[PDB]
Amino acid sequence: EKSVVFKAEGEHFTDQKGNTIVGSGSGGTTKYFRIPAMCTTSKGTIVVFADARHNTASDQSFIDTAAARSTDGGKTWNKKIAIYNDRVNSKLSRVMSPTCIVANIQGRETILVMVGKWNNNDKTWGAYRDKAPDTDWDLVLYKSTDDGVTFSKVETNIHDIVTKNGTISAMLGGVGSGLQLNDGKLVFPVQMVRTKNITTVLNTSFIYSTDGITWSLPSGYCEGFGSENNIIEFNASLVNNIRNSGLRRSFETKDFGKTWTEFPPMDKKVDNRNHGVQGSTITIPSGNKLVAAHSSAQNKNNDYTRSDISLYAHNLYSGEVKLIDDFYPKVGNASGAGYSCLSYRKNVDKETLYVVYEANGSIEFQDLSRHLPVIKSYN
């Protein structure tokens, strides 16, 4: 059913040399975890990434990307650091905010994980709009081809395509999971901070690739809102589902990212109340139809506590929405709360629906597979 993936003030990681990472949690533990991202492989293996915010919950702090791996259905976890920050700034060096994909890349089952990287910036990324792109920023990609046991950097052209665009100060994945399309294409939802001269500070889009090495940006942009977002594939559309204060937003592109229009079955269907929150949106088959499963916070206190992280089903045909399970029916820690990531898989005849989420500085896991008949029937 819950397991603890990463325990606030309860984990000890080691660095590249094998020396302990002394955090600010009791006993020198990692203080806080945020921003979970998960996938399930063809082997049934569960891999969960999260920020290991060793000293504090702040975004502007010393952060590595942790990875937890479970081969027993989420009962127990082997943990390590998958991506280390550059160790320039003991206060501020960070790799953060993962987005992951499990994919068959030219036959090879691969886990991709993409994180933003900063070193000396002491402010949030929206503060740095003078350069194309910001010199402190990068966006790095790591892969595993051994079922999540080891990760290695992927050399990409992502920094170059941002520079060539000329109107982007920084870019980040949409947070949680990206996707592999029916044709094989790899797609990461993205968020971007535009250069100062652009009237809109934030936009949403995606990057795409065939091999995981060479990526492309489409020519268009979607409106940013609170910019964290996921994409689903539905007929010859890509459909996003975007954080926004109040009602979540959803747009579709029928021309592979040149133009976006509102997608009625999801647009303004879930309310996250003041400030908004990241949410996870995926598809689940039901016969030759699809249902969208979505997780985000009800936010009953209308603030940064982001209470009641809940699973919804969206009927992609009728536009009906319903609450499936309030799986974290608790007031969150306003230092950083509310985020989640879903993962659905059918391996042979075994269908699984898993979630990970933020829980008072820890990351928890639940097996939500018992809900699948209810979700699938929502067509």
* Expt. technique: X-ray
| Burial class of residue 287, CB neighbours in 10 A (0-12, 13-18, 19+) | exposed
Resolution for this PDB entry, in angstroms: 1.0
- Give the residue from 155, 258, 250 showing the smallest Cα distance to 206: 258
Nearest C-alpha neighbor of 41 from the set 70, 66, 65: 70
Residue 37 in tokens:
């991202």
- CATH number for region 3-376: 2.120.10.10
**345 marked among binding-site residues:** no
- Interatomic CA distance for residues 349 and 356, integer angstroms: 23
- DSSP string over 8-34: TT----B-TTS-B---SBGGGB--EEE
Based on the residue annotation, tell me whether 155 is a catalytic residue of this protein: no
Q: Is 243 annotated as a binding residue?
A: yes
Token match 């294409």: residue? Answer: 185
Indicate which residue of 51, 64, 358, 364 is catalytic: 358
Alpha carbon distance 126, 122 (integer Å): 12
Q: Which of 83, 114, 101, 97 is nearest to 47 (CA)?
A: 101
What are the distances in angstroms from CA 369 to CA 5, 104, 136, 310, 348? 18, 24, 42, 15, 15
Residue 358 bears catalytic tag: yes
Q: Is residue 339 annotated as part of the catalytic site, yes or no?
A: yes
Q: Which of 22, 21, 48, 51 is nearest to 37 (CA)?
A: 48
Q: For residues 47 and 37, is the Cβ–Cβ distance under 8 A?
A: no
> What three-state secondary structure class fits 159?
helix
Classified as helix, coil or strand, 376 is helix
CA 219 to CA 203: how far, in whole Å? 12
Which of 11, 32, 51, 59 is catalytic? The answer is: 59
The catalytically annotated residue of 339, 354, 357, 378 is 339
What DSSP state is assigned to residue 146?
S
